[PDB]
């Protein structure tokens, strides 16, 4: 007998650019040694000084 409280989600991609996405976890910055990096999509390897 006890009523509920319901919520719907419905996802939809289109020809428009996708503007709603999820969060992007990060990692702290390491200098003076050879590492991989990912700076906003720019991938590579090197020494950050």
């Amino acid at each position: 007998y006890q009523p509920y409280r319901v919520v719907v989600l419905s996802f939809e991609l289109l020809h428009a650019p996708a503007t709603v996405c999820g969060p992007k976890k990060s990692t702290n910055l390491v200098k003076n040694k050879c590492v991989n990096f990912n700076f906003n999509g720019l991938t590579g390897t090197g020494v950050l000084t």
Binding site: L14, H15, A16, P17, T19
Partner: protein, 41 residues
């Protein structure tokens, strides 16, 4: 200094904004003001 002209120097334009709109645009119109408001049907 001169009212008529586009001048004869060089200067470049920085980016301001960027909007994810997804439309079709084939035409435009400026929207400038006046003093006495007229509406056309």
């Amino acid at each position: 200094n001169l009212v008529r002209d586009l001048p004869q120097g060089f200067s470049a334009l920085e980016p301001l904004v960027d909007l994810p709109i997804g439309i079709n645009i084939t035409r435009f119109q400026t929207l400038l003001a006046l003093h006495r408001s007229y509406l056309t049907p």
